[PDB]
């Protein structure tokens, strides 16, 4: 049976429920001649999966009192009557044998708000539970403990002082809370003493505790399937991949290749991404020492085909934070009334991750600057614009959620979203010229076989004004003709590498996806604020 | 047991329930000598938690008559006849013991509108009470009282002269009306001499009947928590201010704000805007006698229409944790729905809940998505969206009473707001916040950091005279870029400085990447008004 030892992982919300039930029973001498009744009703709320129904089973066997269990739809039945009599027959059973705690579950399902539903019995179950807790000299020896994941769906006359007072929040444990979860579900398992768990507490962030139990259970099935003895870190490293916690189950991002080695030349842009998403996660004490808010997410703009969503994939598989991918205008719906909740529930799950990064590519379909200024198209869809404006900075407190945007031109983007605090980084990625065109050919040919030493400087000399996608199909067409002689291997291809063979017919087709007139729109900004303005 | 001295709050409505259930039974020679027969019991309604079940407890002990308890859904059976047989045998039970009182708790469970329901056996139960309270001859001396919180879902054939005479509305107490509710819920407790209950009544607005009983319950638990380290104690206001943080939201639990606070000193440059915004809230709450002496309604509507970046949406976070009022937050279009009824009823259930917890301040951020009224059907904006505007027009002023609710609006485009809202009575205090000048740029940086070492020997006036035409948000990017390079010079191998001593070398590269957000062409749209 579980107890006060297996309930660990929280201290602030655990001591509130221990002095609410056990302390009036183990020490009743100070609650007399003091004038106040002890609190009698405990209701917890939060995300589903944090163990809101486990804690009632832990305090049942620790106090040593009578315990009752009531399910949600187990009381509801036909032959009108007995949907209220079964609630009456359980409170009178707990009325005797003092003290006696009673656990009612699924208050989100039964007893809803009265004026928001249409149910004939539902007006009677929500009011029979009222008179059973504070009626005419009731609430003598019973203690009602509830567990709900949706507190906004219950009746507003239920969270009052007589019935369910002194509310508690069971949230996601992140400020040194994940480590105590791993020390409970592993003391019964055999573990080889060769690794530490201190660095494993900061690997995942969006875990609810039940997912931490899923991480140790994933490594258990990987251990017995590779030995077909204990457990080792290589089974837990397989549990870190394809993790997918319950808070971010709707969005999957773990489908891309490895990164950090395909990009090249853009060292001042890659290092800017390291100083934004790794600083508040790896060193949180440096920000609290200064007492300042960290820098927010980035925004990418420039020529199409420069490497603006592969760099967003570079922060998808390298950093320890989570990822939520939105494929452009994916969160738009045909209904007028919904039209904001897909923007909300992405950012609602983002603030519950603590921390994570999101990606909103093609911001021209997302920003849509001002519907009053545009009348020639007749859009005026300023509802989804103002919803994104009140979710990144907004009203509530910041919980380290970074937003990454990729577009091509910033003239169709609203200046209200271009301000710092929401999207502060306005970096422009340039075109490679004589410095970044040599390191890209070694980065995109990393896992590829090569011949003895061939110079790649002459490829950069011929290609002038070429984008990053324009440097693709120069070497991709080389691998297209590198398998042409493999078809002629019939009666083994005796060349396991790529020799030249292509630049007499592939380098002569200097294809430019970006025109000269289209490049003039990017080279027009030139931010007018310069350096050398310090004090003297 | 409880009495009439153990029940406070309303007093004019206390006498109308004592002259009806005690006065015909104690003084019976006034009705038969002159006038018609005395009236029957009333139906108590109102918000939940105002002392409407404790009110029926005091008449069950001080009157001394026969009392029988009947709950709403307690009278139920799977049989056909016993759904109403227990109501019939209880009314003749109190008829045998004359006089007697009957309390029907939660009568809305067993008395809805008969024309709305269809195909049940509860329509036999609601028609049983029409012939049991005032039937053929079955009404002599018994009186039946009830306590409910929803009078709208009661049939109109139950509230006539025979059955239920008056609809007593035990509402929210007022100034020097919520002082007596706290004193009698703390009398049996041991207190010290430094407590002052008149100071608590001015800082408890939505605390009506049970939250004021939960404030004394949570502060008593905090005294036990600090005593765990026979013995007498004494409460000394250290835990009343602790329990005042989260004890209000009985009705406003859905719209709780947490936990942003700036403590009225993280904002700078707006010296005249802070004194104008505070005086519209501090005056109608702290001095109610000065407004009823002049006989004029105060100013309530505040609207911010400056450019984005000057500090306008977190300025409502300053009034969220400083003034003594409840805060309701509407984060843009967070309440519209595709059900054709909940698109405008979400406006309705917020404002009367705000009118219940008077006084309070609501916050309507990004009104460009709410006040789109004069364009329709304009291609893609969609029709039938002006009903949320016309509902918003009837809740600012409407046809209601002055309940001292305060509306704060934040928008970045003043030309897209509905001009029907832009009028006094709904939003009268239109204040434009400009970009901070060189005299306000010295008070903008010391309020941002407030906890960092400023390198004593340095001067910050060089940033004030330079970087002209910058908003308040762009100057937060400069102090974050300098802190970005400050921790960059401290993440190396320490085998450098174990001190957060940020110098001018970190601000040298911060001014290079600092850019202007509000353009020169965008600034002329706000200056084109000149009102």
């Amino acid at each position: 049976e579980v107890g006060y030892d297996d309930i660990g992982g929280c201290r602030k919300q655990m001591a509130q429920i221990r002095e609410m039930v056990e302390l009036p029973l183990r020490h009743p001498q100070l609650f007399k001649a003091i004038g106040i009744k002890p609190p009698r009703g405990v209701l917890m709320y939060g995300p589903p999966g944090t163990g809101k129904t486990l804690m009632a089973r832990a305090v049942a066997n620790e106090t040593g009192a009578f315990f009752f269990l009531i399910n949600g739809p187990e009381v509801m039945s036909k032959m009108a009557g007995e949907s209220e009599s079964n609630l009456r027959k359980a409170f009178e059973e707990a009325e005797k044998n003092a003290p006696a705690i009673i656990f009612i579950d699924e208050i989100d399902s039964i007893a809803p708000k009265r004026d928001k539903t249409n149910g004939e019995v539902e007006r009677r179950v929500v009011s029979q539970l009222l008179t059973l807790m504070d009626g005419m000299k009731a609430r003598s020896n019973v203690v009602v403990i509830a567990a709900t994941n949706r507190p906004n769906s219950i009746d507003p006359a239920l969270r009052r002082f007589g019935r369910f007072d002194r509310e508690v929040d069971i949230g996601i444990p992140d400020a040194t809370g994940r480590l105590e979860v791993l020390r409970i579900h592993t003391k019964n398992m055999k573990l080889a003493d060769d690794v530490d768990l201190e660095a494993l507490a900061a690997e995942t962030h969006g875990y609810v505790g039940a997912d931490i139990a899923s991480l140790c259970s994933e490594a258990a099935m990987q251990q017995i399937r590779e030995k077909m003895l204990g457990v080792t870190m290589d089974n837990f490293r397989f549990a870190l991949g394809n993790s997918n916690p319950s808070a971010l189950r709707e969005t999957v991002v773990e489908s891309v290749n490895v990164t950090w080695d395909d990009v090249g030349g853009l060292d001042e842009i890659k290092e800017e991404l390291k100083e934004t998403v790794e600083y508040p996660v790896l060193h949180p004490d440096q920000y609290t020492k200064f007492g300042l808010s960290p820098s927010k997410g980035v925004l990418f703009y420039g020529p199409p085909g420069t490497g603006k969503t592969l760099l967003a994939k570079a922060v998808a598989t390298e950093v320890s934070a989570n990822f939520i991918s939105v494929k452009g205008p994916e969160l738009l719906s045909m209904w007028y009334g919904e039209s904001e909740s897909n923007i909300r529930d992405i950012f609602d799950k983002a603030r519950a991750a603590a921390p994570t990064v999101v990606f909103l590519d093609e911001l021209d379909s997302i920003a849509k600057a001002r519907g009053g200024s545009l009348g020639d198209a007749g859009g005026a869809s300023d509802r989804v614009v103002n919803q994104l404006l009140t979710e990144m900075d907004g009203m509530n407190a910041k919980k380290n959620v970074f937003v990454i945007g990729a577009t091509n031109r910033p003239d169709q983007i609203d200046p209200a979203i271009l301000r710092p605090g929401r999207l502060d980084q306005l970096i422009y990625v340039p075109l490679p010229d004589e410095n970044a065109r040599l390191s890209i050919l070694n980065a995109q040919l990393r896992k590829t076989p090569l011949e003895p030493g061939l110079e790649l400087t002459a490829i950069a000399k011929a290609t002038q004004g070429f984008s990053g996608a324009d440097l693709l199909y120069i070497v991709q067409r080389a691998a297209k003709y590198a398998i042409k002689d493999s078809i002629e291997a019939h009666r083994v291809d005796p060349v396991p590498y790529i020799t030249k063979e292509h630049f007499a017919e592939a380098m002569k087709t200097a294809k430019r996806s970006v025109s000269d007139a289209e490049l003039r729109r990017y080279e027009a900004y030139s931010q007018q604020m310069k350096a050398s303005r310090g004090q003297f | 047991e409880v009495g009439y001295d153990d029940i406070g709050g309303c007093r004019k409505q206390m006498a109308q329930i004592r002259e009806m259930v005690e006065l015909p039974l104690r003084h019976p020679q006034l009705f038969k000598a002159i006038g018609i027969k005395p009236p029957r019991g009333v139906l108590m309604y109102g918000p939940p938690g105002t002392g409407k079940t404790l009110m029926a407890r005091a008449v069950a002990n001080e009157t001394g008559a026969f009392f029988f308890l009947i709950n709403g859904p307690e009278v139920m059976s799977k049989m056909a006849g016993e759904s109403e047989s227990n109501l019939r045998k209880a009314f003749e039970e109190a008829e045998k013991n004359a006089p007697a009182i009957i309390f029907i708790d939660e009568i809305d469970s067993i008395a809805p509108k008969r024309d709305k329901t269809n195909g049940e056996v509860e329509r036999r139960v609601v028609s049983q009470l029409l012939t049991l309270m005032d039937g053929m001859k079955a009404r002599s001396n018994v009186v039946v009282i009830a306590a409910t919180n929803r009078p709208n879902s009661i049939d109109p054939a139950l509230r006539r002269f025979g059955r239920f005479d008056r609809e007593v509305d035990i509402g929210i107490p007022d100034a020097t009306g919520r002082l007596e509710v706290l004193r009698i819920h703390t009398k049996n407790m041991k207190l010290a001499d430094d407590v002052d209950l008149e100071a608590l009544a001015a800082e408890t607005h939505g605390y009506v009947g049970a939250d004021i009983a939960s404030l004394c319950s949570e502060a008593a638990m905090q005294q036990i928590r600090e005593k765990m380290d026979l013995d007498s104690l004494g409460v000394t206001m250290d835990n009343f201010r602790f329990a005042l943080g989260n004890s209000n939201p009985s009705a406003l639990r859905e719209t709780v704000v947490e936990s942003v606070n700036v403590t009225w000193d993280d904002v700078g440059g707006l010296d005249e805007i802070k004194e104008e915004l505070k005086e519209t809230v501090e005056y109608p709450v702290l001095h109610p006698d000065q407004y009823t002496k002049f006989g004029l309604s105060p100013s309530k509507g505040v609207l911010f229409y400056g450019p984005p970046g000057t500090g306008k949406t977190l300025l409502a976070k300053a009034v969220a944790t400083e003034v003594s009022a409840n805060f309701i937050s509407v984060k843009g279009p967070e309440l519209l729905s595709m059900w054709y009824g909940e698109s405008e009823s979400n406006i309705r259930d917020i404002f009367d809940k705000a009118r219940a917890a008077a006084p309070t301040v609501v916050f309507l951020d990004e009104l460009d998505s709410i006040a789109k009224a004069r364009g329709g059907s304009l291609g893609d904006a969609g029709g039938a969206s002006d009903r949320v505007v016309n509902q918003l027009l009837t809740e600012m002023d409407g046809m209601n009473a002055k309940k001292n609710v305060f509306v704060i609006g934040a928008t970045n485009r003043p030309d897209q707001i509905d001009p029907a809202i832009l009028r006094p009575g709904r939003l009268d205090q239109l204040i434009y916040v400009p970009l901070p000048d060189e005299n306000a740029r010295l008070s903008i940086l010391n309020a941002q950091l407030r906890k960092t070492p400023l390198e004593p020997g340095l001067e910050l006036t060089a940033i004030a005279k330079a970087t002209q035409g910058f908003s308040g948000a762009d100057l937060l990017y400069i102090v974050q870029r300098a802190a970005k390079y400050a921790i960059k010079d401290s993440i190396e191998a320490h085998r450098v400085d174990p001190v957060p001593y940020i110098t001018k070398e970190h601000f040298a590269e911060a001014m290079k990447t600092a850019k202007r957000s509000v353009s020169d062409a965008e600034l002329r749209r706000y200056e084109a008004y000149s009102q």
Partner: peptide
């Protein structure tokens, strides 16, 4: 262009509950 402003719920026939008359 045109966005639907309503879902328009028009259904739902609720529960029932029987009245078991005793036999003897």
């Amino acid at each position: 262009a045109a966005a639907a402003a309503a879902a328009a719920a028009a259904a739902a026939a609720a529960a029932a509950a029987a009245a078991a008359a005793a036999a003897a």
